Design a protein around this ligand. Structure first.
Ligand SMILES: [Ca+2]
Ligand SMILES: [Ca+2]
Lengths: 87, 89
């Protein structure tokens, strides 16, 4: 069980998996997730992913609780920090 | 208080240990309490308590959650505690 973030729509391009936690921009970058990059993600059923527009869990928040082949044009390429919960 | 979370240097509650009350402890604060970085390998948790262990300082990076006595955190979580939140409920 992990969250996998994808570069492109429909789980395309580069992908990186992360365990529960609170990831800043620099921490995402270390994990090989660039800024303004996430377009789709897989979420284990039961889990919650809070995707933030700005670093340090600020700016607009989008919430995902299931596999999302397309985040939509509002949330697309905006993830700069993220909180992942196994609940 | 006598009830506390006890963190251990080695697997199976081995080596040096440090007990902490509920709170939110950064890296420097852990160090002050005599817990070095990347050091924790096992821990004891009072019933009803929650321990959120964080890979990085300031409660960021991967988070491992413990609600019971844990003789071994696992190789992925091993020697990676850099900050921690302890809850009494
Ligand atoms: Ca993209
Ligand atoms: Ca150790």
């Amino acid at each position: 069980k992990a969250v996998t973030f994808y570069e492109d729509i429909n789980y395309g391009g580069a992908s990186v998996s992360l365990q529960p936690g609170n990831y800043t921009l620099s921490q995402l970058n270390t994990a090989k997730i660039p800024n303004d990059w996430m377009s789709s993600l897989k979420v284990p059923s039961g889990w919650t992913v809070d995707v933030y527009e700005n670093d340090n869990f600020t700016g607009t928040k989008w919430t995902y609780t299931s596999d999302t082949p397309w985040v939509g044009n509002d949330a697309n390429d905006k993830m700069s920090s993220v909180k992942i919960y196994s609940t």
